[PDB]
Amino acid sequence: TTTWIWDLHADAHDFDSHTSDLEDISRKIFSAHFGHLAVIFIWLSGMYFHGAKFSNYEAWLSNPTGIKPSAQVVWPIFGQEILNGDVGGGFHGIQITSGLFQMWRANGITNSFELYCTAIGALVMAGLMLFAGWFHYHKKAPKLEWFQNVESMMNHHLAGLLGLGCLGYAGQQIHVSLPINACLDAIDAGKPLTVGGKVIDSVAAIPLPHEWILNPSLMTDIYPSFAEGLKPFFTLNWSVYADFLTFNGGLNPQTGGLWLTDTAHHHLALAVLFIVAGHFYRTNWGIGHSFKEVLEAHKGPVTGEGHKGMYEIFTTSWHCQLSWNLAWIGSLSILVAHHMYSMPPYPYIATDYPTQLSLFTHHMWIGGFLIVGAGAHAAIFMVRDYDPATHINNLLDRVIRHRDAIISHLNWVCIFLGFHSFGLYVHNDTMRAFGRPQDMFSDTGIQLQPVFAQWVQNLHAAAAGGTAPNAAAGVSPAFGGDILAVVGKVAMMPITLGTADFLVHHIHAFTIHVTVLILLKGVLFARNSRLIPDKGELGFRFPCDGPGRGGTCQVSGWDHVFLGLFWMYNSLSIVIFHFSWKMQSDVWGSVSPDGSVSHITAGNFAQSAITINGWLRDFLWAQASQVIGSYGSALSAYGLLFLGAHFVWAFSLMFLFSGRGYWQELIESIVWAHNKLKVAPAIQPRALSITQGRAVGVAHFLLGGIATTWAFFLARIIAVG
Amino acid sequence: VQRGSKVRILRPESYWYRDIGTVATVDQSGIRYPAIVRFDKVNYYGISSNNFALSELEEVE
Amino acid sequence: TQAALYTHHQYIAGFIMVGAFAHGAIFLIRDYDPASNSNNVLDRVLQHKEAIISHLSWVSLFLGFHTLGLYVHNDVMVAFGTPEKQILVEPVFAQWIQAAHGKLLYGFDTLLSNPGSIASTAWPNYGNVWLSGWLDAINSGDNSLFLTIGPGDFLVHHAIALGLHTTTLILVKGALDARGSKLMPDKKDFGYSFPCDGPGRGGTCDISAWDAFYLAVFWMLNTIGWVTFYWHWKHLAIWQGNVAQFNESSTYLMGWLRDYLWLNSSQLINGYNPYGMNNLAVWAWMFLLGHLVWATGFMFLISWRGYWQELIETLVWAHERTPLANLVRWKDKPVALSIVQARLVGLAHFSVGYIITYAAFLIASTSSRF
Amino acid sequence: QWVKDPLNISPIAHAIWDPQFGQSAVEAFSQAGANYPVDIAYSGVYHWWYTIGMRTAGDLYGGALFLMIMAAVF
Amino acid sequence: TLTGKTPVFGGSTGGLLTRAAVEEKYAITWTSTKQQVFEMPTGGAAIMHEGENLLYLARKEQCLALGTQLRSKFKPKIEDYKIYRIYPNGETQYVHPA
Amino acid sequence: SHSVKIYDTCIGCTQCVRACPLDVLEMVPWDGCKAGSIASSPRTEDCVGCKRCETACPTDFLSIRVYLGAETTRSMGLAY
Ligand code: CLA
Ligand code: CLA
Ligand code: CLA
Ligand code: CLA
Ligand SMILES: CC1=C(/C=C/C(C)=C/C=C/C(C)=C/C=C/C=C(C)/C=C/C=C(C)/C=C/C2=C(C)CCCC2(C)C)C(C)(C)CCC1
Ligand SMILES: CCCCCCCCCCCCO[C@@H]1O[C@H](CO)[C@@H](O[C@H]2O[C@H](CO)[C@@H](O)[C@H](O)[C@H]2O)[C@H](O)[C@H]1O
Ligand SMILES: CC1=C(C/C=C(\C)CCC[C@H](C)CCC[C@H](C)CCCC(C)C)C(=O)c2ccccc2C1=O
Ligand code: SF4
Ligand code: SF4
Ligand code: SF4
């Protein structure tokens, strides 16, 4: 039957269902991890090769504020060469929003040859990753006590991968990128190009970065303490180094980005903190802390046996580690989005509004998908790797024993948060339609001021000179300060929080708590419930347990991931809509020579984002005029993909709203017409399974829904920003 | 009948209605459905072997 | 009023037509007698029921592959900047019928537009008293009597034919498989409406004949949606004095999204705004209410029962363990809605949200400028 | 008032009694030449009752009383 | 009317409700040769005793799911479990194995 | 309660009795098949309707059929 065609691709990387023993999965996992690093290196090589052969990168380096970054060129077929829009610099291509150009300029890359060797250099680390996954699997495989040596892994990744990377990048910053960026910020301004023979005048006239290495005399005219050398480092007379290791603390007014002397002292201070942290765990040389002993020490009166069993599952279950590591990488990818818009770390990235919106939105969606996978593999752990003998009266035993207290309280706080966040919006819709604007929740009606967030903003704007005395400016202009403007556009200004920001922040609190509720109910009830006492016997992924007990459709842990994906989609769509409207209304825009900001949507967030009608009219109807009017222009691919993603999202509802018992019976009338005549197959056609129809339905729902926002965001922000 | 004859099935509730099948064994015991018939294609849950009474059956081979 | 009356009686006709097939399937389960009806016309349509369903399946697939393919091809031509490469098939058969009824715009000059044809003169009796009044009204370019149709009217009639055939396909296959199929041969023993037959035999979700009613209401609403979108946009183009806007934009699907849905939403969603409100505020509020009811139906259609039954079990626990509230005891045990019930409740929210969204948009986009 | 000028008078369905209205919603729905909040009828009952011969509110009132005793008969 | 030791368990939120007091109850008794760890059908780990055990559960399906765990998850197998339906008047009907 | 019906095509393979999570079914000596046993359903008032028995039945069509009837506290699987 055709069911085996889909089960072959579904049972591909489920390695611990192929083979029982723990050591042989760990060699397949270790080898496939090399194969995923090679996939990244091939993709990373393509970003540098298309950066070197199909771009306007040096033309962008000459004029960063007036030339759009482009790195994709479209072949002239079928009329499709209209997508090669004039991005400036005599170049016809697709404007890119990934921020590759602003990252390379912060790396000191100036010409296309340094991008070419990085493309080839990434392409040979792809092959050495493919060799190391073949050598460590097919020839000389490691052993399980090396895999379970988690004290040495946490030592060698803290002081190693994190320590020697933060120190090694501080070396790249100080010796290579700090000169060229101090050079490029001089050529960007009119004066001063200080100094020398060559003084510097061209971008190509900037010396190739091995000449900053070979000649310490070149390094001293910009930073005068390089004549003092490596010697006050060993005497700990360290305040002489305050020329390339600064604590300026804010944004460079020339580029808009972070101070690259601050980022070098950032990566240096973390290198010490990571290497110190990498001498924490006990290994062969006697001293240190052990994981297991420090786990069983924390055992208080309220919580039973405490952290017993936590070492055992984190060293014997791959799914327990994967669920926990997905929860933190996804939470970090969300934190990356918040910290990169508001403390923009690349030169000329903050006024590149197509780049700032795309990078916040991309790393939001990556973070939300990986957090959903945390709840998936935590429910897989409970079905497969959970052991009752490991957990008697410890913390994992005691969360299971009060899971009805946990879920019903989370249930109540979700209903409270939905009523007291969304219900305020439809209260406002009704009061505005009634002609009662004084009865609305608004800044001019019944005020809901976010007074705790406004108080935290006051502490962070009054930090420089106060609770952080040795810092010049505050950590970001978003917390308070004055408007920082690169050539005509706002890089960052204070982001005020009024009643409209109180409302949408409690929408975020509501939609995250529901997503937690779906995923935590899937983990805590994966093994059994009062409805299905043997749910762990039926597996992680099964459709139901029949129409009895009233009906038990979607009881599995898999189906909570299925339902959690929709609510993650709902949660993050509002997050990126909150970002896109608040940045266009209150932050981004053009600066006059007099110094007043003309915002992109002209401050309409405070009075329109308090109703659903305002989100429909002033955000969704108004800003979609760029994507539906883009036909016959360079943005016409966004107009086609806007419609095509509307199609795919609607196509998903055939799978989500229907069931396979209809489709199997319709196929019976199709195979009759195939048997009556001709070619009718031997592999007998089936409808998709119940689980696959949900999987197909949620995949096209997520693809069609996210790509609709993608084409809407990019067509809007490229045209108006 | 004879073991190995091709067999047509004439009952509505069967998956293999008017299908041609191969007999595996027949027993003369007196049971309600003595004829094990194998089939070339699986049913909706993978059986390819069902017992039938000869009062339900047609053969051309 | 003319827009409201057409859409009212077409959506009511769509609901009545689906219910005709619903009670035809209930008859085949409850009342049909194969002993009395033995080799009659009604016995015979069930015997070649795989030929009727497979031929409906081919017409649905042929129309959908070629109507959508023609729309997407025209969309790519307009988006690439070449609107003369798009495929514009003239509806020459229905223009000929208009000429055959007395319309002179296409210049065919057959009967009733031929002044000397046999049908126009009505030869042996000459009792053609209606004919002068009819040809006066059918050649007046100011009424809705046999409107001028072009290539935008060709594609949308084949979309309507797709919707008529697919909705019939779901309803006929629900009626003709109501007594049994190969997945469930004894289906008449279980009634018109039942959840499933369990996850065995591959899985049997939505196997009943009631479930094919349930799927066909979706296709009915989509069909009457395509019907009343086309009636409204063609008439709104005529009433605004710009019939060329329909003739240029209805051949690709971005024109339907931009020049019909987006363009005519402007006065509706400004029924209230931060500067005040007007008389369209009730239609603006109903417009958003309809989007809310429609989306609430998706919860009942996508999330299914056993999630909610296990959730209600923790709420039953919390009430019994809460002091001052466990004094209040329910009479009926709280359970989740049944599998059939939430298909019905989900379809009811979907349908109610479908109707009042379009009714708010139809009335507010027409009465704001007229 | 509608039969005197059926081209520019909008028909009235019924009056609005909604106590939750603000005062600018009372003026926004006081339309069709009425000084109380009304709904503009779109069912076509004005165009139908005018064509079949009704002209006054007393005509429709006797029609309303007649369908009430007819409903009581059924 | 039924003897056996209650398993060592701190209690949970998944156990008996008001139905166990006013409508119907269920108990499963079994005899074990070891003091070992088993999973509760209502969630959580408990300690069964050597000798006779006795556990009150809300549904018959929870008792039979525990008896399936007593069969297939222990060395040696535990077949001798008996399931009783307890009514609120005190009448205790032996229902499994019938 | 639900109705569980065992038909004359049962081969006595007892897989439906092993599959039942509520112990509804048991084997009765029958001598109407080669195995001499047939499935029976004495405790149908404890049947939840899960149809795990129908999933295990290897005859085509099924020798055991579950008919979902009037709902009780037992058949709805309620612990409350
Ligand atoms: C480090 C990250 C990571 C790793 C190593 C794994 C690994 C695994 N997962 Mg997990 N998971 C993750 C993250 C991860 N996952 C995330 C982020 C989610 C949320 C979506 C999940 C949710 C999840 C579920 C619900 C399940 C798993 C399962 C599995 C196991 C089998 C996967 C397999 O063989 O499918 C084969 C791979 C495929 C069939 C690929 C399908 C990709 C679909 C079609 C989307 C593609 C969209 C694409 C990006 C868009 C391009 C469109 C274009 C092509 C047109 C394997 C152990 C399964 C399991 O049983 O575990 C024991 C299982 O049921 N995962
Ligand atoms: C606190 C962690 C941290 C932060 C904020 C930064 C910040 C920066 N990095 Mg650096 N870097 C770091 C650590 C960090 N780095 C690590 C761990 C590595 C790998 C070893 C690097 C290697 C690296 C390279 C190669 C490059 C950068 C660049 C940059 C700049 C822009 C891109 C960016 O990473 O966004 C900000 C990132 C975040 C907000 C997320 C932080 C993620 C880390 C893993 C969290 C670490 C955990 C934490 C420190 C533990 C707590 C300790 C204790 C207080 C309890 C920005 C100033 C780029 C640049 O161009 O510089 C100008 C660049 O090319 N970084
Ligand atoms: C717009 C459509 C929509 C709406 C309104 C809901 C509403 C809800 N979902 Mg659902 N959901 C949806 C789409 C929707 N969902 C879809 C498409 C799916 C498919 C994946 C789901 C799947 C899903 C899951 C998996 C879960 C939910 C849950 C919930 C509840 C969250 C708790 C809460 O906020 O209570 C408050 C109710 C609201 C905020 C709704 C609006 C109510 C307004 C403001 C009140 C006005 C009426 C008032 C009572 C006056 C009476 C009027 C009249 C009767 C007189 C809430 C009832 C969760 C839950 O039950 O948690 C407790 C949960 O776990 N839903
Ligand atoms: C916009 C959403 C959408 C679309 C496109 C469809 C499409 C279809 N429905 Mg479905 N349906 C939908 C929503 C939708 N439905 C919803 C919400 C429900 C309620 C649950 C249903 C319930 C339903 C029922 C009950 C039935 C259908 C049937 C059909 C098929 C009708 C025959 C036809 O017209 O063939 C034309 C084909 C299409 C229009 C789809 C093909 C789209 C293009 C051509 C694909 C191109 C290939 C693509 C580029 C490759 C992918 C790229 C890469 C990833 C590989 C068609 C596939 C019927 C059926 O299947 O009979 C045969 C049927 O009985 N539908
Ligand atoms: C399933 C079933 C059922 C149902 C059925 C139905 C529901 C159907 C429907 C159907 C339909 C609903 C049909 C219709 C048809 C119609 C037609 C077919 C018509 C005709 C027409 C014509 C023919 C016309 C023509 C003309 C013209 C056009 C012009 C003028 C002249 C003349 C008049 C000539 C029953 C109950 C039996 C029961 C069993 C089963
Ligand atoms: C999940 C989050 C929880 C959300 C809970 C929301 C509950 C409802 C909010 C009302 C409670 C606070 O509401 C508070 O009331 C007073 C009195 O009207 C408001 O005061 C407002 O209206 C009065 C009218 O008399 C004006 O004089 C005043 O100028 C204006 O600010 C405050 O701005 C508001 O802060
Ligand atoms: C439409 C639909 C189907 C029908 C969809 C099916 C059967 C998928 C099959 C479609 C594929 C694309 C058929 C292609 C067959 C071959 C792969 C094509 C061979 C030719 C290649 C070279 C392209 C279900 O099976 C189903 C199951 C459960 C819930 C909802 C639904 C549901 O909504
Ligand atoms: S409807 Fe489908 S998922 Fe639900 S119980 Fe029936 S077979 Fe299982
Ligand atoms: S009913 Fe089915 S499973 Fe039970 S004994 Fe008979 S053949 Fe075996
Ligand atoms: S439906 Fe479930 S409970 Fe009833 S007999 Fe079958 S397996 Fe047992």
From TrEMBL, chain B:
It is found in: Cellular thylakoid membrane; Membrane. It holds the Pfam family PSI_PsaE. It is a peripheral membrane protein. Keywords: Membrane, Oxidoreductase, Photosynthesis, Photosystem I, Thylakoid. One of its GO terms (cellular component) is photosystem I reaction center. Its main location: membrane. It comes from the Bacteria. GO terms for biological process: photosynthesis. One of its GO terms (molecular function) is oxidoreductase activity. InterPro entries: Elect_transpt_acc-like_dom_sf, PSI_PsaE. Belongs to the PsaE family. Stabilizes the interaction between PsaC and the PSI core, assists the docking of the ferredoxin to PSI and interacts with ferredoxin-NADP oxidoreductase. This is Photosystem I reaction center subunit IV. It comes from Halomicronema hongdechloris C2206. The gene is psaE.
From TrEMBL, chain C:
This is Photosystem I P700 chlorophyll a apoprotein A2. Belongs to the PsaA/PsaB family. PsaA and psaB bind P700, the primary electron donor of photosystem I (PSI), as well as the electron acceptors A0, A1 and FX. PsaA and PsaB bind P700, the primary electron donor of photosystem I (PSI), as well as the electron acceptors A0, A1 and FX. PSI is a plastocyanin/cytochrome c6-ferredoxin oxidoreductase, converting photonic excitation into a charge separation, which transfers an electron from the donor P700 chlorophyll pair to the spectroscopically characterized acceptors A0, A1, FX, FA and FB in turn. Oxidized P700 is reduced on the lumenal side of the thylakoid membrane by plastocyanin or cytochrome c6. Chlorophyll a 29 binds at H165. Chlorophyll a 27 binds at H157. Chlorophyll a 4 binds at H8. Chlorophyll a 21 binds at H8, H9. Chlorophyll a 25 binds at H73, K85. The gene is psaB_2. The PsaA/B heterodimer binds the P700 chlorophyll special pair and subsequent electron acceptors. PSI consists of a core antenna complex that captures photons, and an electron transfer chain that converts photonic excitation into a charge separation. The cyanobacterial PSI reaction center is composed of one copy each of PsaA,B,C,D,E,F,I,J,K,L,M and X, and forms trimeric complexes. Chlorophyll a 22 binds at R44, H48. Chlorophyll a 23 binds at H55. Chlorophyll a 26 binds at F93, A94, H158. [4Fe-4S] cluster binds at C196, C205. It is found in: Cellular thylakoid membrane; Endomembrane system. Coiled coil: none annotated. Chlorophyll a 32 binds at H349.
TrEMBL record, chain E:
It is found in: Cellular thylakoid membrane. It is a peripheral membrane protein. The keyword Ribonucleoprotein does not apply. Transmembrane segments: none annotated. One of its GO terms (biological process) is photosynthesis. Coiled coil: none annotated. Keywords: Oxidoreductase, Photosynthesis, Photosystem I, Thylakoid. GO terms for molecular function: oxidoreductase activity. GO terms for cellular component: photosystem I reaction center; plasma membrane-derived thylakoid membrane. The keyword DNA-binding does not apply. Its main location: membrane. Belongs to the PsaD family. PsaD can form complexes with ferredoxin and ferredoxin-oxidoreductase in photosystem I (PS I) reaction center. This is Photosystem I reaction center subunit II. The lineage of its organism: Bacteria, Bacillati, Cyanobacteriota, Cyanophyceae, Nodosilineales. The gene is psaD. The chain holds residues 4 to 101 of 142 of the full protein.
TrEMBL record, chain F:
GO terms for biological process: photosynthetic electron transport in photosystem I. Pfam families: Fer4_7. Its cofactor is [4Fe-4S] cluster. It catalyses: reduced [plastocyanin] + hnu + oxidized [2Fe-2S]-[ferredoxin] = oxidized [plastocyanin] + reduced [2Fe-2S]-[ferredoxin]. SUPFAM superfamilies: 4Fe-4S ferredoxins. InterPro entries: 4Fe4S_Fe-S-bd (IPR017896), 4Fe4S_Fe_S_CS (IPR017900), PSI_iron-sulfur_center (IPR050157), PSI_PsaC (IPR017491). It is found in: Cellular thylakoid membrane; Endomembrane system. Its main location: membrane. [4Fe-4S] cluster 1 binds at C10, C13, C16, C57. The keyword DNA-binding does not apply. Its EC number is 1.97.1.12. It comes from the Bacteria. Residues 1-30, 36-67 form the 4Fe-4S ferredoxin-type domain. Signal peptide: none annotated. It is a peripheral membrane protein. [4Fe-4S] cluster 2 binds at C20, C47, C50, C53. Apoprotein for the two 4Fe-4S centers FA and FB of photosystem I (PSI); essential for photochemical activity. FB is the terminal electron acceptor of PSI, donating electrons to ferredoxin. The C-terminus interacts with PsaA/B/D and helps assemble the protein into the PSI complex. Required for binding of PsaD and PsaE to PSI. PSI is a plastocyanin/cytochrome c6-ferredoxin oxidoreductase, converting photonic excitation into a charge separation, which transfers an electron from the donor P700 chlorophyll pair to the spectroscopically characterized acceptors A0, A1, FX, FA and FB in turn. NCBIfam families: PS_I_psaC. The cyanobacterial PSI reaction center is composed of one copy each of PsaA,B,C,D,E,F,I,J,K,L,M and X, and forms trimeric complexes. This is Photosystem I iron-sulfur center.
